[PDB]
C-alpha cells in the first residue's frame, strides 16, 4: 500500500507539471483502490483467524 501510494503521488505530480495524460492518473487511482481493498481483506482474515 505504501509503495502504490507513492507511485500515485508521483504520477499525479507529473500530470500536473504536464508530462503525462489524464489516462495514466486513472490507472494509479485504480491500483491504489485495489491495494486498499486487499489490505482490508487481510485485516478481516486476521480477525477471522483469531
Amino acid at each position: 500500500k505504501e509503495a502504490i501510494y507513492r507511485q500515485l503521488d508521483q504520477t499525479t505530480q507529473r500530470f500536473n507539471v504536464g508530462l503525462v495524460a489524464i489516462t495514466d492518473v486513472q490507472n494509479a487511482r485504480a491500483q491504489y483502490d485495489t491495494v486498499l481493498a486487499n489490505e482490508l481483506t487481510a485485516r478481516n482474515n486476521l480477525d477471522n483467524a483469531v
Binding site: 500530470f15 504536464g18 508530462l19 503525462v20 495524460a21 489524464i22 489516462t23 495514466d24
Partner: protein, 50 residues
C-alpha cells in the same frame, strides 16, 4: 478533452516550428545560389562576356 499529456502537444508544436525554420534555411540557400544568375540568358552571363 484532456485525453493526451500536455508535454506531447508542446513537443508537437515545437516540431512544427523547427520544421518551418529549417524550410526557411533551405529557401535562403536557394535564393543565395539564384542571386548570382538572376534568370538572364546564358550567352549574356558576365563571365562569358569576360
Amino acid at each position: 478533452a484532456n485525453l493526451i499529456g500536455r508535454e506531447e502537444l508542446q513537443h508537437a508544436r515545437d516540431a512544427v516550428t523547427s520544421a518551418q525554420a529549417q524550410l526557411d534555411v533551405a529557401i535562403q540557400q536557394y535564393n543565395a545560389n539564384q542571386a548570382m544568375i538572376l534568370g538572364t540568358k546564358l550567352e549574356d552571363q558576365p563571365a562569358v562576356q569576360q
